[model samples]
Target: KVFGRCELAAAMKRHGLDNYRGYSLGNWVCAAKFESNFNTQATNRNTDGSTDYGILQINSRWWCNDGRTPGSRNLCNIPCSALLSSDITASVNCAKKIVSDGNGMNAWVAWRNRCKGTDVQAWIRGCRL
Candidate 1:
């Protein structure tokens, strides 16, 4: 498991995620913290017969294939479980695509419900970038 927000932020930066697609580094970091607590194994089933996966908690309804869902669109063309890996490359790439699709961080309910309008910079507090 990841230790703290700083570590996660550093990794995300290494993965070329900072300041991606018009969003701030704190925005991505804050969203990931609330969405998965920086744990790649994070997964949650929505009541709408959809599932969220990984650090970014991408929804199966549009981004990834879970094998059980039909017509998922699977825009990333990767398995949903891939998002659960310690490597953030795939997840970060998919997340970029999601944002580029114009959904912004709103694609993530956690971003909408928690990170939005909040002081996102606090997510990187004490982290030496």
Candidate 2:
């Protein structure tokens, strides 16, 4: 399903991710952009035999379970496929919990590589959030 950046920003704000767990909205926006280009259905297999899921690109090894992926911890207790839904409720919730667990957005390599220390203010430009 097609979605807009403005809508995503708005959804993140609505979920209190604007500054949840001490991270800013810009962090979340930039991570989503670099991680999956805002595609909810995005999935990528890792060299470690894990897969990332959803707009946030959450990992099946730690956060979600795909059933077929052996040894998945499934800490989020959610099906990996559920993260691909357009609703974003579950994905954002899991993301918040992941950040709260002390890794911060560093749990996402995209945030560390591209969004970190960068001026991400422009990500929400004209969103009016």
Candidate 3:
């Protein structure tokens, strides 16, 4: 399902993304916006044969184990398919695990390109926190 902006903000906040790992709510919100446009079922295949999955586009190469990814990290230990669920709890939690592991929110390259060092708070400006 494509999430409404405010709707996703509230959902991510509820799942403990607000200020997670020193990232403000907007950092998460902005990255997801660019990564998947808040589409839970989003997927993109990489040139290296890895597939990015779900709202946060967690990669099969390092996070979820999508059987097809060679030498997959499976760090999150979930089937890559799980990220596609419309209910984002799994994706949100996995995202937390990503940052919690000290990998930095730069896991989403889009974050560094579009959201990092900018006034990202504007992404959630009217979301009412």
Candidate 4:
């Protein structure tokens, strides 16, 4: 599911991502667009042999177990496959824990490089949430 900007906005807002961890809905929406392009089953294998999964692109090395990443913490304690589900419950919950892991939303490289300090509000303009 490659969600449209408004679609993602409404969904995330409903899930309480509007200001989770001091990050705005636009922040999450912008970061997600760059990270996974709003795809539910997105996956990216990093050079370190760890893979990022789902709309949030949760990492296998520290978040979920994919049976491949070395030194995996599986901190989220869920299978990496769970991140790929259309449900997105695991993805959202793991991301919440990630933000609380003391990195805020900076855990995602895409957010740092692409969304940090930008005018992310326009990403969800007129979302009216």
Candidate 5:
């Protein structure tokens, strides 16, 4: 329920996601739902039970390997404070790329279905920017 119009609207603009349908919007909502429960500051554990931070659940190692070193301090060293300063637009675009990777829109569509059955817009409206 942390997705919101302002965030979505900003995301849409920031990520070049214009002309999206409700299902597309819902898919993005669903992606965040799966990734970080829509919390901008959310983090997760790996199979080894170490932390990965931010809404995209970015593994500090992976991000840092790609030169996004702001969160890389130690293994699973990503912190919400660093993540809060992270670029959400870039993250959302990465999710979109992941969702659309040559397999077509199936993943994104499935994601949309999960939230479409619920009040996705309401959830979007409920979220904080």
Candidate 6:
């Protein structure tokens, strides 16, 4: 279920991030691998051991139970309630919102601008998969 070429391409198109699918997904996957193994259902806890919450490791207390609010909080995790809804748009939109000041697509632009000069960008662009 890892995001390979076809799925990633489709996801980029679905999210209106056609131009940035490669770079943005690359950066996101890098972060996801290091942070949560790309598992949206992943979670962690504080040193004191309080449930930190779902995939992307968002804090439940700070971000849970609220209706979608762009630029409000991390919108990365799939809510347990909305998990099987077949509405990935909401989650992806939320993620773009969180990343792009709630515009998701613009975040890809900003990210490319910022990450362009690094090894990260080179690798992502070079792959050309």
lDDT of 2 by residue, 1-129 (tens): 446888889988998899898788888999999998989999999988989999999999889999767787999999999999988999998998899888788889989999999998778889978
Q: Write the per-residue lDDT of candidate 4 for residues 68-126, one digit (tens) a residue.
A: 99887899999999998867678888998999998898898899999999999999998
- lDDT for 22 (candidate 5): 23
Global lDDT scores for all candidate models: 0.87, 0.89, 0.90, 0.90, 0.49, 0.42
Tens digits of per-residue lDDT for model 1, 87-106: 88889999989998877778
> Which 10 consecutive residues of model 6 have the lowest summed lDDT?
48-57
Error of 2 at 68 (Å): 2.5
| The 10-residue segment with the lowest total lDDT in model 1 | 1-10
- List pairs with backbone clashes in candidate 4: none
Candidate 6 lands at a TM-score of: 0.46
Candidate 6: tens digits of C-alpha lDDT, residues 35-93: 44444445565454333433233443334333433324434554533422333354454
Specify the poorest-scoring 10-residue window by lDDT in model 5: 71-80
Which candidate, 2 or 3, has the higher TM-score? 2
In terms of TM-score, which candidate is strongest? 2
Alpha-carbon deviation at 9 in model 2, angstroms: 0.3
Worst 10 residues of 3 by lDDT: 99-108
- What CA RMSD would candidate 6 show? 7.0
Which residue runs does candidate 5 get wrong by more than 4 Å?
A: 1-5, 18-23, 48-52, 58-86, 103-113, 116-129
TM-score of each: 0.93, 0.96, 0.95, 0.95, 0.48, 0.46
